[PDB]
Design a protein around this ligand. Structure first.
Ligand SMILES: [Zn+2]
Ligand SMILES: [Zn+2]
Length: 76
């Protein structure tokens, strides 16, 4: 599996949407129906999945599937 698939699976699990809905362009709030706690636990999920802390200022930009992928990739 790849980081990309791992990220999409997590967003899927966390936002309760089927995998096909987790497109690279998809916006968590606008497109995937996320509310505040959803975006907070998603980032929390990504930190545990990849065993790494995500600083708040970087986390705030993780608003789309692609942004989540780019952050994790950029951090190894
Ligand atoms: Zn990859
Ligand atoms: Zn949209």
């Amino acid at each position: 599996s790849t980081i990309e698939e791992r990220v999409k699976k997590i967003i899927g699990e966390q936002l309760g949407v089927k995998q096909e809905e987790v497109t690279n362009n998809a916006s968590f709030v606008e497109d995937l129906g996320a509310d505040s706690l959803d975006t907070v636990e998603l980032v929390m999920a990504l930190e545990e999945e990849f065993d790494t802390e995500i600083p708040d200022e970087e986390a705030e930009k993780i608003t789309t599937v692609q942004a989540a992928i780019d952050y994790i990739n950029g951090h190894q």
